[PDB]
Amino acid sequence: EDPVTGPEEVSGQEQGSLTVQCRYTSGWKDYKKYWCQGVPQRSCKTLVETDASEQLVKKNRVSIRDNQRDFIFTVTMEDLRMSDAGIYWCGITKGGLDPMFKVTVNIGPV
Numbered sequence: 001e002d003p004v005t006g007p008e009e010v011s012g013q014e015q016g017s018l019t020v021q022c023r024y025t026s027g028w029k030d031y032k033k034y035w036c037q038g039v040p041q042r043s044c045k046t047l048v049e050t051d052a053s054e055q056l057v058k059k060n061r062v063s064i065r066d067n068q069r070d071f072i073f074t075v076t077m078e079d080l081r082m083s084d085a086g087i088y089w090c091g092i093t094k095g096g097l098d099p100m101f102k103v104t105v106n107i108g109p110v
Helices: none
Strands: 009-013 018-024 033-037 045-049 057-059 062-067 072-077 086-092 100-108
Touching (some): 018 086, 045 062
Antiparallel strands (some): 033 086, 057 062, 062 072
């Protein structure tokens, strides 16, 4: 299958939170995983990235935890703002073109 896959879209509410599950194939177990934002795709802004271990990492309001048993890294976006809406990417860091999957984030008020 595809190196990395996730939901096509995910929704959340202001001040609430949302979680994204980025599924990857076994071979990418020991690669750093990341959550990227914006376009162009290959110029996206990295919001958080792991160190290739299962240790949870957090930067600002985003968290990332890689489960190397089920091969899925979970991204959590908290204290959601309407401005958080947009295009994001599940990604796996490697020399060259990284495996990436586009995830559209929708945010609703109140």
